[PDB]
Design a protein around this ligand. Sequence first.
Ligand SMILES: [Ca+2]
Ligand SMILES: [Ca+2]
Length: 139
Amino acid sequence: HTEKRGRIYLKAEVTDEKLHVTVRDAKNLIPMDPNGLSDPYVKLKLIPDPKNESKQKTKTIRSTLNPQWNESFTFKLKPSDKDRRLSVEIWDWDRTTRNDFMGSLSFGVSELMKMPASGWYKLLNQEEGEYYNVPIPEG
Ligand SMILES: [Ca+2]
Ligand SMILES: [Ca+2]
């Protein structure tokens, strides 16, 4: 169900004291719906975020194993924000059965404040997607 064959294109770069994040698209996804395709929406949050007001989501794609979102946001928080973790979840919206989770990713904010994390990324599991950072070349 969680297949680490899919790759998600995430970019987080700090410019003018604003964290300009970008979610371009993903490729090599697995069939998650009865349609034989996937229809995921990306949620970008700065954890811990229990009230999920930092968590911003994009809209779902029709039906494609290569969903393209092309969203970009700008969220900076007071200096304590560097201690947070930028966790991005990939959930498929299903009214038929259940939301299909294939994977997620996370970036260290202290890392992003010193260097912009921009490129492809591998699908991490739920435990990993809140902690680890593993950027993938894919090019
Ligand atoms: Ca599904
Ligand atoms: Ca779906």
